[PDB]
JSON list of C-alpha atoms (C1' of nucleotides) in Angstrom, two decimals:
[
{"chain": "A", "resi": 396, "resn": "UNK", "atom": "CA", "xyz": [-14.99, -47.99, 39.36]},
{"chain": "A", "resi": 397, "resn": "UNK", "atom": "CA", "xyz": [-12.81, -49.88, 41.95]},
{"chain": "A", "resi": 398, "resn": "UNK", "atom": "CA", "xyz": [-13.49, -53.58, 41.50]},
{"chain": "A", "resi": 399, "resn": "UNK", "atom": "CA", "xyz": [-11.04, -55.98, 43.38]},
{"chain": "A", "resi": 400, "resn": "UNK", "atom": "CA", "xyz": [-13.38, -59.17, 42.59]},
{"chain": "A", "resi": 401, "resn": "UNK", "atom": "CA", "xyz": [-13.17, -61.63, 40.22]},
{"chain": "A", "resi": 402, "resn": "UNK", "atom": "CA", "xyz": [-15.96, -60.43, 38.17]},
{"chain": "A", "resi": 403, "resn": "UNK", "atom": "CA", "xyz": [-13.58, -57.66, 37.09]},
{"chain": "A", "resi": 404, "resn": "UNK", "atom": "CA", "xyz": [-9.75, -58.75, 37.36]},
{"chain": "A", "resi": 405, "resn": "UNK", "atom": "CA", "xyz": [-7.81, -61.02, 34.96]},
{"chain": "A", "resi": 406, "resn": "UNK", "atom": "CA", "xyz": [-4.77, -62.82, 34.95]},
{"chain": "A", "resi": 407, "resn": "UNK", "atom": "CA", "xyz": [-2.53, -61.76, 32.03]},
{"chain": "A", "resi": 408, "resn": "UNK", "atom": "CA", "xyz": [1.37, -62.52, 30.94]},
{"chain": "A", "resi": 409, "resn": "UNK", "atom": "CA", "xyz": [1.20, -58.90, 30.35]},
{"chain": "A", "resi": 410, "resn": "UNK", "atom": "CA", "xyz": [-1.19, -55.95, 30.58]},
{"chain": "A", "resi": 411, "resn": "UNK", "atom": "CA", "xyz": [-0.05, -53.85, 27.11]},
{"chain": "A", "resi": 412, "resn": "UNK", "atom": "CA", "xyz": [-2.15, -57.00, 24.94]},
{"chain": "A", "resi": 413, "resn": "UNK", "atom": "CA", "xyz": [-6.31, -55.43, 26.43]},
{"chain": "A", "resi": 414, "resn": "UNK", "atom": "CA", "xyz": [-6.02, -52.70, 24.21]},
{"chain": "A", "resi": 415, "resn": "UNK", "atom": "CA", "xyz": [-6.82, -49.39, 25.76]},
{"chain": "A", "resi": 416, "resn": "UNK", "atom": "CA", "xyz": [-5.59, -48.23, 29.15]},
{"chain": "A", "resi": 417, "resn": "UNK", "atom": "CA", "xyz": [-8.85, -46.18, 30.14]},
{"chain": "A", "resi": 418, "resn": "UNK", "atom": "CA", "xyz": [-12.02, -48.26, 28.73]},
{"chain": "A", "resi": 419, "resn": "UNK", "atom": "CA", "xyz": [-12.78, -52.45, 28.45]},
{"chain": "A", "resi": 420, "resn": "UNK", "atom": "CA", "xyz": [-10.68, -54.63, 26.11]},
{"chain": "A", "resi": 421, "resn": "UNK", "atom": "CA", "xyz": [-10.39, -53.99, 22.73]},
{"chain": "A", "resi": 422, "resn": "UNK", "atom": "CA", "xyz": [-11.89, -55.24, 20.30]},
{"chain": "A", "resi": 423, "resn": "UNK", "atom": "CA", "xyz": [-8.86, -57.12, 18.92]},
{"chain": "A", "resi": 424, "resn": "UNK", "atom": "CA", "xyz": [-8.59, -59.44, 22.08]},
{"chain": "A", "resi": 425, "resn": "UNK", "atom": "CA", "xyz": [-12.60, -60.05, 21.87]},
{"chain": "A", "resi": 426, "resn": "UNK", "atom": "CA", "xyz": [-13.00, -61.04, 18.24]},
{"chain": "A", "resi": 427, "resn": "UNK", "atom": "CA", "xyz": [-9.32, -63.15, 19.14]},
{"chain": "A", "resi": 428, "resn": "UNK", "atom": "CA", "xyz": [-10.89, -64.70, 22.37]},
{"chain": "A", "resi": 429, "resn": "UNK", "atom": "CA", "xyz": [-14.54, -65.12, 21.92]},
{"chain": "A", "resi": 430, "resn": "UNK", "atom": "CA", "xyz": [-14.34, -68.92, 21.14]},
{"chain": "A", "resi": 431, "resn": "UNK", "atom": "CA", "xyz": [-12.36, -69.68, 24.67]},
{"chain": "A", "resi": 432, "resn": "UNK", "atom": "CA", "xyz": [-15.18, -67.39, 26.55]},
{"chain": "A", "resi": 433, "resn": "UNK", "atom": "CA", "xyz": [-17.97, -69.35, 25.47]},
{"chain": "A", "resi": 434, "resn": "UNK", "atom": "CA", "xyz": [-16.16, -72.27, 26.17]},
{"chain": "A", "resi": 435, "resn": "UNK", "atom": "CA", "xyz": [-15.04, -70.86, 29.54]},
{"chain": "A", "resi": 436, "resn": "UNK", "atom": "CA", "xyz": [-18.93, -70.07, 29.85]},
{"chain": "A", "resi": 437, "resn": "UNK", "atom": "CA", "xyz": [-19.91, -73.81, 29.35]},
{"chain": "A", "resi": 438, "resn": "UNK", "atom": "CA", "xyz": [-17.03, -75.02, 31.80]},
{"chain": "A", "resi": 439, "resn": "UNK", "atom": "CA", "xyz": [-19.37, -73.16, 34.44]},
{"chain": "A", "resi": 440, "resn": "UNK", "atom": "CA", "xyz": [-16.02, -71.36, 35.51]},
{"chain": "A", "resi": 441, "resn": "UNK", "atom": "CA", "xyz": [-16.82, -67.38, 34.73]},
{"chain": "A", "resi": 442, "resn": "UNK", "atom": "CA", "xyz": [-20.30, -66.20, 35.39]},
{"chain": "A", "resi": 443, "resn": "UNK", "atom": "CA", "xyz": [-22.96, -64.53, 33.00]},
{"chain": "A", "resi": 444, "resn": "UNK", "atom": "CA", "xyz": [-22.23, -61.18, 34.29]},
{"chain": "A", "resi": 445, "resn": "UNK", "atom": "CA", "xyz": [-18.00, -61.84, 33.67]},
{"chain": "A", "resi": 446, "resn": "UNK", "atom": "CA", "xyz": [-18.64, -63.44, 30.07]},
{"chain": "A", "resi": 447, "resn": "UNK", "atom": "CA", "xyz": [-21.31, -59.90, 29.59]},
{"chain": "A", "resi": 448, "resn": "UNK", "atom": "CA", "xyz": [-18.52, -57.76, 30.93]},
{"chain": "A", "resi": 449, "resn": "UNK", "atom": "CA", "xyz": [-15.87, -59.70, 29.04]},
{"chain": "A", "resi": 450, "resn": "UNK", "atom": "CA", "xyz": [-18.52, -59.43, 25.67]},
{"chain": "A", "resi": 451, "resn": "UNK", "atom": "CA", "xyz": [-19.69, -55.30, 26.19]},
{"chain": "A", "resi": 452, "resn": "UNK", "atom": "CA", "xyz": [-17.01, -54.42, 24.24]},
{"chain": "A", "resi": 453, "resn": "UNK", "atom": "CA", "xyz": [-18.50, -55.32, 21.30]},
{"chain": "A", "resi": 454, "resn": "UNK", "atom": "CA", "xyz": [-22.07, -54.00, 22.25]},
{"chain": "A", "resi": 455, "resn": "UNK", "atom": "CA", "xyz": [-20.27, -50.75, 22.55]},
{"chain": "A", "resi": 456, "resn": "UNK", "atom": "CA", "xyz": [-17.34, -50.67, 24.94]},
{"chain": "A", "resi": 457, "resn": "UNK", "atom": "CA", "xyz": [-18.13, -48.58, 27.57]},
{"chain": "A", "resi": 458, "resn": "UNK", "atom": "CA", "xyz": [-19.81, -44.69, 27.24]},
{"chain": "A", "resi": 459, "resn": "UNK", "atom": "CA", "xyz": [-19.26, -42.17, 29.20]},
{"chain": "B", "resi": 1266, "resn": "DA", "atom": "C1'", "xyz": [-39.17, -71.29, 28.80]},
{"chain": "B", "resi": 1267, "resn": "DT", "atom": "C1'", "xyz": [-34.03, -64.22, 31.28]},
{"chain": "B", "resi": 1268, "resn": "DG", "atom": "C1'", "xyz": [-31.06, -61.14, 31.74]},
{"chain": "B", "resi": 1269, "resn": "DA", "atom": "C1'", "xyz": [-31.87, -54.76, 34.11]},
{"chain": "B", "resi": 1270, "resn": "DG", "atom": "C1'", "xyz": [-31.58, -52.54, 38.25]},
{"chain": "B", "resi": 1271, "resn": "DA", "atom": "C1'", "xyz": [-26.83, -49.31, 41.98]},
{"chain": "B", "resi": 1272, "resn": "DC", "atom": "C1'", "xyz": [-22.83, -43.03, 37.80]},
{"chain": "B", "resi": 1273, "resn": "DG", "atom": "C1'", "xyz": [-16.64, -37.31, 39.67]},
{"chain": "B", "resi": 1274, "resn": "DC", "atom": "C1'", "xyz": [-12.48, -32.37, 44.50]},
{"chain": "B", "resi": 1275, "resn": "DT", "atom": "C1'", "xyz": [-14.39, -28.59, 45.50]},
{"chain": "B", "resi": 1276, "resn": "DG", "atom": "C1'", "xyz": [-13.52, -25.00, 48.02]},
{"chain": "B", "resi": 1277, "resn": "DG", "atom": "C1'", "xyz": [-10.22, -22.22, 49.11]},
{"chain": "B", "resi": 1278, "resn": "DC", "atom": "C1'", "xyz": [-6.66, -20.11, 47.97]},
{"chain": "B", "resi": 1279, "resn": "DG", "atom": "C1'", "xyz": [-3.66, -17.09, 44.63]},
{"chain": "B", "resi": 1280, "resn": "DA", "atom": "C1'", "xyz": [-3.46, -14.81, 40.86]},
{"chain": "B", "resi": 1281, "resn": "DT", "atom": "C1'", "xyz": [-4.76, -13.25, 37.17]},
{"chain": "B", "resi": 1282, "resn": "DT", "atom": "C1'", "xyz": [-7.72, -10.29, 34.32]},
{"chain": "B", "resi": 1283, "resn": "DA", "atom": "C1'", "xyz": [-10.81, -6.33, 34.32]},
{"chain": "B", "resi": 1284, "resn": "DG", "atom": "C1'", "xyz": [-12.37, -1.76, 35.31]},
{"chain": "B", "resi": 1285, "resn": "DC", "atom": "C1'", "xyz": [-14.22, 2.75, 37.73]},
{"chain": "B", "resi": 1286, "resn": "DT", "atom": "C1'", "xyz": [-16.17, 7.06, 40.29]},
{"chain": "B", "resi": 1287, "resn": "DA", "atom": "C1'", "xyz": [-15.12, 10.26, 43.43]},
{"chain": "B", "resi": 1288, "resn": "DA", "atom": "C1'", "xyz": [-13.11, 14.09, 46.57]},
{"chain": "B", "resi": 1289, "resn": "DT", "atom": "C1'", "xyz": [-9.99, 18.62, 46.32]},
{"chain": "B", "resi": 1290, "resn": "DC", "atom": "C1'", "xyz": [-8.69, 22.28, 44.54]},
{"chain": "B", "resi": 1291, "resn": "DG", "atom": "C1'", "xyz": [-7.52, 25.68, 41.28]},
{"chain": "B", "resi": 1292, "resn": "DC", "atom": "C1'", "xyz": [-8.58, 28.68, 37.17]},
{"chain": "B", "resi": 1293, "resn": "DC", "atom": "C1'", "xyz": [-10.79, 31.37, 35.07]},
{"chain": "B", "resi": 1294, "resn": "DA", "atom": "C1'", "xyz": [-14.07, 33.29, 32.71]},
{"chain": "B", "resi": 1295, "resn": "DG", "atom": "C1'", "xyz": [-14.59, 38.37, 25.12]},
{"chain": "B", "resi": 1296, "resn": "DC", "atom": "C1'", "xyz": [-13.96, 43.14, 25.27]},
{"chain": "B", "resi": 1297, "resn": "DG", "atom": "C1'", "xyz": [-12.51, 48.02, 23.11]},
{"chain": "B", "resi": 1298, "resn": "DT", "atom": "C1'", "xyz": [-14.46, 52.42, 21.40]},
{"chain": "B", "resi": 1299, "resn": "DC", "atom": "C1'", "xyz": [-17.27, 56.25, 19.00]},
{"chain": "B", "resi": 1300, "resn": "DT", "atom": "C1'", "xyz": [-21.23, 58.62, 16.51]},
{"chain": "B", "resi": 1301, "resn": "DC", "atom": "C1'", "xyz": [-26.22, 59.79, 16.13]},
{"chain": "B", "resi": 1302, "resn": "DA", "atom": "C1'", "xyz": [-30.74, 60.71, 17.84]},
{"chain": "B", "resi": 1303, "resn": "DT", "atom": "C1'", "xyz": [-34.55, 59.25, 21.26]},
{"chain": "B", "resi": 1304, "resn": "DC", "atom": "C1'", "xyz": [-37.34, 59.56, 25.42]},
{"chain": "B", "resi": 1305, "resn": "DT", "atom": "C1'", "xyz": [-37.98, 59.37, 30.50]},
{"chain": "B", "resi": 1306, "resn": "DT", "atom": "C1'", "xyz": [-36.84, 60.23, 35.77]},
{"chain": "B", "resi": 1307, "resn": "DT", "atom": "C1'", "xyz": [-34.65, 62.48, 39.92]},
{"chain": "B", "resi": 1308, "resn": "DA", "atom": "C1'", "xyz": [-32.37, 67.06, 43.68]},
{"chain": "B", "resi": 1309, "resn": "DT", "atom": "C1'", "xyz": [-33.86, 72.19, 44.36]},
{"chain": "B", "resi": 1310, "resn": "DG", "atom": "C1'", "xyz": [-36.87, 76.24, 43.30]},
{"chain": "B", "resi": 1311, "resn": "DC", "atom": "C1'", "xyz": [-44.40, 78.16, 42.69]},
{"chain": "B", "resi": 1312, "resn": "DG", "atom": "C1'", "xyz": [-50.26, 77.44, 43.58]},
{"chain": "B", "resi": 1313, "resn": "DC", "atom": "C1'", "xyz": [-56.19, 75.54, 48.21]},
{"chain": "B", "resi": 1314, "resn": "DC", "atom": "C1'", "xyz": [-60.33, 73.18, 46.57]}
]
DNA sequence: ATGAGACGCTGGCGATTAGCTAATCGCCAGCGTCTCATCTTTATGCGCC
């Protein structure tokens, strides 16, 4: 999909450490980063639906 | 006593990839014999209810 909102965009130092190219971060970065997501999430900064994108990886990245 | 519902280049090319009767004409066609007998039938020729 083309998304040019926040709900999907980042801000990295460089775009080789999400993982794969061609699906949502891998699960490296969300077993690595899952402690500063929630805490993002209780900051009131990201939404629900950018901590559920940032967190789908783990319920099974994304299917076809 | 919250967290789902909304999903692509195809058509128009080439260029493979595959496959098929039909219309025209020519060629060329197993054949050789004899014996033996056997019957017919025909042409002509001869007769009155």
């Amino acid at each position: 999909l083309k998304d040019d909102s926040i709900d999907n965009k980042v801000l990295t130092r460089s775009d080789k450490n999400r993982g794969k190219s061609d699906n949502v971060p891998s699960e490296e970065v969300v077993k690595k980063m899952k402690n500063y997501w929630r805490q993002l999430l209780n900051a009131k900064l990201i939404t629900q639906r950018k901590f559920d994108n940032l967190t789908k990886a783990e319920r099974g990245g994304l299917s076809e």
